[model samples]
Target chain A: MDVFLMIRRHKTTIFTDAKESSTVFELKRIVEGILKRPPDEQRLYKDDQLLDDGKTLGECGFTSQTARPQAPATVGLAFRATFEALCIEPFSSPPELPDVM
Target chain B: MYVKLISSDGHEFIVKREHALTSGTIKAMLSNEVNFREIPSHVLSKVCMYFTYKVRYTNSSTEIPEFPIAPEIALELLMAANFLDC
Candidate 1:
């Protein structure tokens, strides 16, 4: 399944598209776009474990479902970034199907 | 320059200006500064990718490959594309 890749730095959450096969190196480059930090400095961690630069998201079981906040942070329609510190997060809604007709 | 796209859930995609404006809805929003309260992160992310994919092959003379979309979200993606007019 395709996935949405997300990572956090301090109080910011970086949202980028990714697939199971996409590599951590690619994700590091993705974050590099906004953080303006070298990939070496942008360390991706989950539960205090640093991600392997050469590995794929699937290899580490990373996915929108697995890595996310306990409860999502949103302000109705205002659309603001959640100020969650030191944790990676992504969309974890269960089956986002609503009558879109 | 880059543009910030915030999905309904507050997930943000820092897309480049060129790609973000590829969507007519987004362009019409003139707008930008979209809160996209109706668009979720899952759908919004794909829409952002489509923006890039569209520009990457917009004027190509050679064959351009089809864009990759997840089957899981293809239906919602369609609805989002229609809403965005991309």
Candidate 2:
């Protein structure tokens, strides 16, 4: 049976399909195609629980009963780069001085 | 050269062409791809400040300043940033 998937990251949402028996690793492969990030760098979460790569989609609650009968199952995707690349430290001093000088 | 950017609420900002072009949306506007007459003036002003800051300190040794935003308009500003691709 086909399972519908909704992948979300930042402000983007992507919808795709997979087989019920497909593993999380296979899902990551699909995510890589859309996000341009490698599978190893992609993290998938379902209802805030981290999903293991070796587990089947059905085991991860992608079954028909867990998902809305008419809607796709949703998963959150975040990249390692999202945190590592955009780490801006909090400012501790006035910033207007630079423009004045 | 300076460009006149009119905000949606009848506010007008005369800014440097270089600084304004830092935003992809503004660049496209200058290229005549779409009109900018409907952009919110207050939001545009904030974006303009960011552009000016980006121009001055993007490569400097000094820490980049954080842009101040009211929580109420945070989502709108984020949407604008996404639209501008800045």
Candidate 3:
């Protein structure tokens, strides 16, 4: 059975659908197509627990059999770039002279 | 001395040994323990550029020049960076 999925990334929400046996890696591939981000840089979360890349959606509690047919499964996505940019800061030090005299 | 790096797609680059060694992965590859010596060409090219920039400006400037990269490949580039520890 196909399960509807929702990906929440910051202020934007993305909607997609996948099969129960689809792995999180497959979900990442779908997200990569939509966001242009790679799977290794993506962090997926659901109900406060981080999702594993090797596990299937059905194993992760995102099965169509468990939820109402109309209710879509929700997952959160965070990209490394969003947080890495925050760590960048200007250097504060005197310039060193070249070793050559 | 120069080291040759070939990508998965067979692209080749002959770069300065010192410059290539700026990446931890390349450094490790050069060591006696590991036999690996190649890297993804596109990613290695970017890393080489960064090494050049770093050696040229690391002690002379406070601001690093922005390195432009396409969004689609940024994640792959980052993974490469992590492996290289640069």
Candidate 4:
């Protein structure tokens, strides 16, 4: 049977569907459809532990038991919507010295 | 299939058709592919929570837990509930 997952961030919540046997990776793939964030950038956690991408939802205790209502640790929506524009530039590496050189 | 609800404030919420039908108003709407609107974010959120709570206790033979409502939104919540016919 299909299950519901409520992904919450800040005061907002996002809901999606998946199978019990679906891997965290598979779930993350579904997440990207709405969030637009890649799985690698999407880290899911339950309680205090990080959810491993390779693990199945059931193995992570996302069974019919814990999922009674269903739900995510969630990525933070800390930045303003405009912050996304800055993120378009790939992250990394810098420094060409001029004055000090 | 998944249903996405866009509250009046434009905050998006998602829920499955199976559970979302708890709302008589929602059940009345046959279209699951369309975005549900009008309900504000605060009211719409509690509506979703109420959907699961309605399901959680419906099948239970055990002791039921009382669902709590915050005092602030009580009026709006009640109004939304009336509209939803929940």
Candidate 2 versus truth, CA RMSD in Å, comes to: 17.4
Model 1 C-alpha lDDT per residue in residues B1-86, reported as the tens digit of each score = 66777778877766667777788778777543567888777777667666655665579886776676656687777888888877
Instruction: Write the residue-wise lDDT of candidate 1 on A1-101 in tens digits.
Output: 44544455432444444676888778777766766766666556555665677998778776545532221112111011342234435563536555663
Model 1 regions more than 4 Å off: A1-86, A94-101
Best by lDDT: 2
Best by DockQ: 1
* Recovered share of real interface contacts in candidate 3: 0.00
Query: Where is model 2 chain A poorest over a 10-residue stretch in terms of lDDT?
Result: A86-95
* Better model by TM-score: candidate 1 vs candidate 3: 1
| Collision pairs in model 1 | none
lDDT (tens digit, per residue) of candidate 3 on B3-70:
65554434344445676677777787786222224344445545555665555456765555555665
Mind giving the per-residue lDDT tens digits that candidate 2 earns over B34-62?
Answer: 23554564466566666655666577885
**Model 3: how far is A60 from its true place, Å?**
0.3
**Model 3 CA deviation exceeding 4 Å by range:** A66-69, A81-101, B1-86
Arranged by DockQ with the best first, the candidates are: 1, 4, 2, 3
Docking band of candidate 2: incorrect
- Ranked by TM-score from best down, the candidates are 4, 1, 2, 3
TM-score of every candidate's chain A: 0.59, 0.74, 0.74, 0.63
What C-alpha lDDT, on a 0 to 100 scale, does residue B52 get in candidate 1? 55
Model 4 residue B47 distance off true place after TM-score fit, in angstroms: 0.8
| Residues A1-101, model 2: lDDT tens digits | 66756565543444455788999999999867655688888888886688899999998889855542125466877677453322212211212323331
Model 2 alpha-carbon drift over 4 Å, by segment: A81-101, B1-86
Residue A9 C-alpha lDDT in model 3? 60
In the range A1-101, model 4's lDDT, one tens digit per residue, is 45556665543456554677999888778767666777776666665366788998778777654554422223222123233211111111222333441
Question: How high is the CA lDDT of each candidate model?
Answer: 0.61, 0.63, 0.61, 0.62
